[PDB]
Design a protein around this ligand. Structure first.
Ligand code: NAG
Ligand code: NAG
Ligand code: NAG
Ligand code: NAG
Lengths: 97, 49, 144, 24
């Protein structure tokens, strides 16, 4: 439901769906879309279904190709400093399709 | 040979035995060297003369 | 903490660390390799989707947290076993006395007893010695 | 080129596990 909406809010409305009392089924995360950026920094993208979390935050954005690579810890630009800043100590994964 | 927690071991004993083949009489096996390699080993080949 | 060797202006990401290994690491085994980590299904000889580089940069850039500073950690592995020693500390060289009840600290093995020349057959690699029941019985003189 | 003949190990391959002297 969060990866198949119709009006994913852009960078000015980070549009977060908080995750609790869920099941972390990441098979959909793999088979869904051909993908273009699947960078994981703090958590492995395969050794993660064995980890249990308290809450998970997913922010759905709409940007261009350059901004897709721009979204990264410790980065500057029109989207990494003025609209949405990624923390340096961020542990998680990014999805871009 | 073995490399448990590194430490390659070579135990040796030389005897000009009857010489038919791999014999049957028991023999002890004295160590020669003990070197703590601390590397990873998986295969085994040999050089010739 | 080593802030004066692993930090510099404008950042420093020289160091590296692994998070993607095909299995758990056995003790004291190095797995240094730049083999691209493809979980996926496809071969992925190169980079890209679901087939990523196994090791990431630690990102030890100056200071961004007390729990995130550049700590230098070194581990010292001793082997306290019955084997010929190589490293010691301060040494006293009191001359050996036999046929007398003495306290001995032979090569780290401490104890009390009486010593005498024996007629055993220690092989040059044998150091400690024992008796029937697993106790230090005869220690060959490392000097003479 | 070498052969790959199979033989029985019989009783063999026992070394000294440690550097500790023993008798009887
Ligand atoms: C931005 C926010 O706080 N909550 C948003 C909400 O406004 C939006 O309607 C919904 C679906 O688009 O996603 C969430
Ligand atoms: C979104 O859902 C509809 C029906 O629920 C489905 O037909 C469509 O394929 C879905 N979108 C994607 C990208 O799978
Ligand atoms: C050593 O290599 C084998 C295969 O080459 C591998 O299975 C094992 O995990 C490695 N161990 C270490 C400590 O590198
Ligand atoms: C000094 O050490 C060497 C090393 O074996 C040996 O000659 C002996 O243990 C010592 N020399 C003496 C006590 O004169």
């Amino acid at each position: 439901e969060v990866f198949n909406a119709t009006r994913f809010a852009s960078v000015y409305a980070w549009n977060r769906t908080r995750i609790s009392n869920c099941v972390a089924d990441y098979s959909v995360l793999y088979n869904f879309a051909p993908f273009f950026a699947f960078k994981c920094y703090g958590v492995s993208p395969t050794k993660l279904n064995d980890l249990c979390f308290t809450n998970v935050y997913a922010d759905s954005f709409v940007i261009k190709g350059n901004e897709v690579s721009q979204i990264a810890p410790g980065q500057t630009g029109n989207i990494a400093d003025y609209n949405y800043k990624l923390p340096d100590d961020f542990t998680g994964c990014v999805i871009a399709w | 040979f073995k490399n448990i927690d590194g430490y390659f071991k070579i135990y040796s004993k030389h005897t000009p035995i009857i010489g038919r083949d791999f014999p049957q009489g028991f023999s002890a096996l004295e160590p020669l060297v003990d070197l703590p390699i601390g590397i990873n080993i998986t295969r085994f080949q040999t050089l010739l003369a | 903490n080593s802030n004066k060797l692993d930090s510099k202006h404008s950042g420093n990401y020289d160091y590296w660390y692994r998070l993607f290994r095909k299995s758990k690491l056995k003790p004291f085994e190095r797995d240094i390799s730049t083999e691209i980590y493809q979980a996926g299904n496809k071969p992925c000889k190169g980079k890209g989707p679901n087939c990523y580089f196994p090791l990431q940069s630690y990102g030890f850039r100056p200071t961004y947290g007390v729990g995130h500073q550049p700590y230098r950690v070194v581990v010292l592995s001793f082997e306290l076993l019955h084997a010929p020693a190589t490293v010691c500390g301060p040494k006293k060289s009191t001359n050996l006395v036999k046929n007398k009840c003495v306290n001995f600290n032979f090569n780290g093995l401490t104890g009390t007893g009486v010593l005498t020349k024996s007629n055993k057959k220690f092989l040059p690699f044998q150091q400690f010695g024992r008796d029937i029941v697993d106790t230090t019985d005869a220690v060959r003189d490392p000097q003479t | 080129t070498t052969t790959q003949s199979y033989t029985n190990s019989f009783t063999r391959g026992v070394y000294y596990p440690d550097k500790v002297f023993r008798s009887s």
